[PDB]
Amino acid sequence: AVVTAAGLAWLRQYLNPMGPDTTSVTGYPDGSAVTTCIADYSNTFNVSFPPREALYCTGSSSSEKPTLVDADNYAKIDKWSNYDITLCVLALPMLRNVVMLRLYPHTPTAFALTEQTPNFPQRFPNWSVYSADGTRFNNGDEPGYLQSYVYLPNVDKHLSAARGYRLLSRGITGIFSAPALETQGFVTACQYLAEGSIQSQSIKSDAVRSVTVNSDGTVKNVESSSQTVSSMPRYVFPLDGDNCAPSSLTETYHQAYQSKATDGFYMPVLSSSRDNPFHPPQPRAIAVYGSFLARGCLDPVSEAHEADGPTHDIYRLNVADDVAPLFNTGVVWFEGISPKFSLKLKTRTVLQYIPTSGSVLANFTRHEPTYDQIALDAADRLRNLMPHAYPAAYNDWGWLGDLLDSAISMLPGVGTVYNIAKPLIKPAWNWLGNKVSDFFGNPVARDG
Amino acid sequence: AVVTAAGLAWLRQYLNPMGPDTTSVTGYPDGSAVTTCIADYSNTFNVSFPPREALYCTGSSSSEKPTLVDADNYAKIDKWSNYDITLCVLALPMLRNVVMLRLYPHTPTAFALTEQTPNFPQRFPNWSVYSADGTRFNNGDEPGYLQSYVYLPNVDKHLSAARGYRLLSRGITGIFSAPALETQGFVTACQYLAEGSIQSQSIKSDAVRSVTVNSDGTVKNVESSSQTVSSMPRYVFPLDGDNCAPSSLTETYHQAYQSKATDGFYMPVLSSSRDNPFHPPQPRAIAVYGSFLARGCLDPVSEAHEADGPTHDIYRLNVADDVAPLFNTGVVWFEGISPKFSLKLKTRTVLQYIPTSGSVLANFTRHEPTYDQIALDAADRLRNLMPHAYPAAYNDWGWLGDLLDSAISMLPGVGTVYNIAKPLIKPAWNWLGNKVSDFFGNPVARDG
Amino acid sequence: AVVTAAGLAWLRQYLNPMGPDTTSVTGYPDGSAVTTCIADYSNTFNVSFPPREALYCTGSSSSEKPTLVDADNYAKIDKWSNYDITLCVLALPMLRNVVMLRLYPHTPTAFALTEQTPNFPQRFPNWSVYSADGTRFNNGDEPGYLQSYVYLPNVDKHLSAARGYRLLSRGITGIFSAPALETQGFVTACQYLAEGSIQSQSIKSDAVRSVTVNSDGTVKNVESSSQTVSSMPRYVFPLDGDNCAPSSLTETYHQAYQSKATDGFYMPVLSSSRDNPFHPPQPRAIAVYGSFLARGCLDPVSEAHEADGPTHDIYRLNVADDVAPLFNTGVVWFEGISPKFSLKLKTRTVLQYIPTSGSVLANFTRHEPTYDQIALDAADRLRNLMPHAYPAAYNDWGWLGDLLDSAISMLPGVGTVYNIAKPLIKPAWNWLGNKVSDFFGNPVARDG
Amino acid sequence: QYIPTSGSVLANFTRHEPTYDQIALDAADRLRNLMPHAYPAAYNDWGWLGDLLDSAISMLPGVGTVYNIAKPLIKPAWNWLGNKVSDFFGNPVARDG
Amino acid sequence: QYIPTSGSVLANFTRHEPTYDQIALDAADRLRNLMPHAYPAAYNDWGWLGDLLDSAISMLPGVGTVYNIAKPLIKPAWNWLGNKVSDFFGNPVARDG
């Protein structure tokens, strides 16, 4: 009838993954009664404007040939460096490939994605170029943007050796810096659930046409294999790419975070569900789910037009991974950034494993199947009222824990002993105008 | 620890969508903290025996040609009009295409469905004819029944412009009338969860057979492409068509509603789940899930017979839509109806949207992310004890709200302050014999 | 605010399916308000070392020919009978085919499964032989192990005649015996959730190659159909076959049961979820989910290598069934068993039906849609702290019910009236060393 | 009721409480001669049945009686043709259909 | 505000509470002649508005008044050029931009 210590610790690391006090690492409070090993991956990447040597092309040029650097089309990308730029990060719930970095000459109207599968998507220090017309880039085209994946290798190496896993928490911090007199820019952050699923797109086969004209050979096998079948199963994410523009996100979600660029960001991605069960590792090809062109049988049609129905485009990412289901997809945008910026990305991913016998993880297990129902209910309660992100320097929340968690742990049901803990009001997170008030009306003087 | 006003209003519109007091429209009480726009679609259709001009044929006759009216086989359908008829409505959870109307010469043994995909299914004012042998109808066959879809166009137009949606409530009313001295007939209504899912049926490819007999041409590519693959993914509904006969529904479900025909009906379709999350629009081809013929590997067989296993027939509807998951499928039957009847269908569908930026919905948003846990728990509690339908004129329930909702809002957990609200007894909804008693023993004198 | 009698009875049969006091049969406490019929299937099988007449081969030898007995390779299996053996039973949640028996000459390193689909898997009295190299067995190979399915025919016959079903409880008892002076051996038991799903494996089509060399015939249709498509949908179980070795199971799960062989076993398989909804019968081909060989797009690759990505092997069982979702998969191992053993398997499967009108089940319905929330919460609570199995003779648990269920029914939320029921401690189930203590510290003197 | 044959289908549906109640049998034998042979098709859920008729008549058999007096029992008048129907306790029957 | 035409797009967005409030209309008619015609672009969220100005002026109309006295109302001085701005209750306006 009261939150335990372990449940409270889990709640604190789940809501504040990169808070300074989160030193101990604790598991999900459900009493799984299974030997588990919890791993904490902290990584840091200094991302800036890439030089030409780390810049490959995804077109059919690098199709069978390995990665092809840019044949000194880098002049156009220098032209980008003349003006201000835009930098998106997209944190899908994939376990490895923690985030997708993307660099634009200027803010796009939507999070476009190429129809054709790219060639050799590049891990972070390298980038891959895409054309301005939303197609893959071969040398001699017009570069549209740069893209890269931030890859955690230890996560792969450990996920190989595990019966099951579950993501405990994940946080991404964006310490931003730029030369003095060029600190201009804005930052926007938003989380939302993009519930992926294993789907296969609808494709067509090819009808064989043989015309034997020989004196005895007159078979004429004109049989039509050109029917509609299902492609490979892929894990498909329904992120509304057309609606991931910054302004749309700000006006849609009330917990979205906005600030000047120098504040950076700190996104503690949150689970969208209430239970977090173990899953066997299942690396699959990831794809992102587009829109449909032909209305098809959305209108009265014939049998022949049942096939070309509302089939949504599926954009292959050419990246395989296993995803943490029920976790929010995060996205931040930096607009009007000076091209000679410097973003220090810090990712902290803590996740639980069930070690496979004889594997490396077996030597690190740590056994307390603690149970705490109240912590889970409190997390489900708090999901809908935490801000989506905070300034990069905003850690060690005074309101968290002894105040917010305690005040909200008395609401669930009537599992309450303390009569009243503390009144809870609606916080006002106006970082742009320095009028920030936390959940209890206390103001927030600037700590950076 | 007490139901709010907004939660109560949502509960009232969810349980009584077409009640007279439901003037205000309110959203799902989960505090989604998202800019939302709630739309209320009220539609009315006067359905009667169709004339010949509004009656098309679905056979291969109208395959590439557009819809083909009946070549004055309408004499047989007049013969139908000689005797009494039967009228089914099937309310699947599809957002548009609110209901499926179907007209039978006499009550069928099951809700049959054609194996071959029909041609040009018709929106309500028009109908489409199907043969008596459970096949599509070409001119010169024996007509078996008529079918049509009741289509809401504004729902489509708005669903185009939305990031996400969720169905809040849906009600269907069936005001029935007929000439005096021909009021004879019966009405039956039942709801049940038919949990659809995205499935692909198993089909076969075609093996190519080339016999080059030329002096140098002797390739003989006899390779067999005749393997088993997966067809298009479709949203498949597991409605037991073989068991949707009226009598079976009455004897299976205790909340099923039965009455004389003149009472009409009023079905407030209910959600089968406890949470109602947003979903991106996903129009897919709808299909209904049949039964299997060949037992296949249900018995010890060889590899070659693994393929022809228990593959269930999938009946394509040739209709594309996106469905409200977790909502019950409703069905009503009118038996022994005078053929010159008149049914006024009134559908009220209220559903929430997340507007896309710049779309029309953006001008109508209305922002109060109210939270009310007790309302959700009360709805989950009440799901299993509300009647499936009421007489068409039975609105403004005295027992609802101040009595039923209040009495049942004290059960959940022990989140209770008022000591005792009101004893709750088992109601007796015997509309046929005029012995109706509500949830508190009060009787129901006839209001129509 | 207190557990009902019906809820308590359901809890007792769910946790102790084969306890002597479980005479009455009761349904799931959710108040489904549906006409239901509960069936109780109790079966007994005396399994021992099979003789040659009941021993078929699964290789391509018995491909189109029906089952083929062993062409007196039975000498090698007698050689097995010279030494000690190993006997696994694998209780997947399939409704019919209650368990899979498997016999090994000596303990394997993993629960291997053949890549090629076997021929004519045999029901229990017969067995099917598999080669030592993990392939199907034709006469003249090296036999690796024997396998059979324990099939319940009445379950099939009743599942044909039902709108919907749900598994209420299932227990498997393993009364073990052997000639005196040969009682040596060990027994291990473990349950774990293997959440299956309808998946289709990725396969390839075949590219047609026609070279018309005729004077007028020069078509040369070289079109490539050799693309990647999806195979048949199958219900796929993610059981970690590589990690089902006995020692790994013992060291992974803390509730795993270990004892000397003569103790037998008694596994009350438990649901892994909290709600148990009805489902329509859906017999599908069952398959077990393997591992992947080629890393594919787990590394930066080209489009052509997106196809050969991490595709996991799917082992077809050549058995069709419909499964009880959310129920644990059980597995027991008997090591070092004298080859002339005798295992009396007793399975009790109790499950609910919604009868189809006019079917046989309709004559046996029994209507009390009892509701009991507390029983469901108590079951969810108890899931994680019950032992996975008990000695075959350990029934009629004193601690169960009046003590364990009562003590734990006061924890959920604060729905508690009795101040304190009884302190609950951590039980110590050390059956090997005769130091067994139940949940309240009381010891367990040996009852057999 | 059935006694299932071993291995038959009925064996899977058995339901075991050999309840004994002598008073119910005596009450049924008593009531046999004074129940109407039929009722209108819509006449179910008899108010007089059970808590009133069965209780009132369960005290007659022998002297196996604890409650002093339950309720006086009169001769009902089932005149369905003329809408003058009175049940076993004089209460009238307004038409329910 | 709109009255939607049947079947039109607006019909899907209707929102029904025909609220009546006479006092609000009278207060608006009263306030029309004494509000400034415009304010500096950054001058929003008026402290004097509503709880002070509307409340103080809602007691004037007729004698439909319950609260004895709300707050004295003086003549504001909107001198934005010289930074000598005083609102309707004499409180000054320090520059917010």
Numbering used by the authors:
A (entry chain C), B (entry chain A), C (entry chain B): 66 to 513
D (entry chain A), E (entry chain B): 417 to 513
Paper text:
The LSV2 VLPs reveal structural polymorphism of T = 4 and T = 3 particles according to EM images. From ~11,000 particle images recorded on a direct electron detector with a super-resolution mode on the FEI Titan Krios microscope, the capsid structures of LSV2 VLP within T = 4 and T = 3 architectures were determined by localized reconstructions to 2.4 and 2.6 Å resolutions on averaging around the icosahedral symmetric axes, from a respective single dataset. The T = 4 and T = 3 LSV2 VLPs show external diameters of ~492 and ~448 Å, and internal diameters of ~294 and ~250 Å, respectively, with a protein shell thickness of ~100 Å. The models of T = 4 and T = 3 LSV2 VLPs were built and refined with the homo-trimeric subunits A/B/C or D/D/D. Each icosahedral asymmetric unit (iASU) of the T = 4 particle consists of four subunits A, B, C, and D, whereas one iASU of the T = 3 particle comprises A, B, and C subunits with the C/C dimer taking up a position similar to the C/D dimer of T = 4 particles. Accordingly, the T = 4 LSV2 VLP is an icosahedral symmetrical sphere consisting of 240 copies of the 57-kDa full-length CP with 80 apparent trimeric spikes on the VLP surface, whereas the T = 3 LSV2 VLP is composed of 180 copies with 60 trimeric spikes. Long spikes (length 3.6 nm) protrude from the center of each homo-trimeric capsomere at icosahedral 3-fold (I3) and quasi 3-fold (Q3) axes in one T = 4 capsid, and at Q3 axes in one T = 3 capsid. Besides the overall differences in VLP diameters and CP numbers, the local difference in T = 4 and T = 3 architectures is that the icosahedral 2-fold (I2) axes in T = 4 particles exist between subunits B, C, and D in two sets in the quasi six-fold (Q6) arrangement but I2 axes in T = 3 particles are present along the C/C homo-dimeric capsomeres.
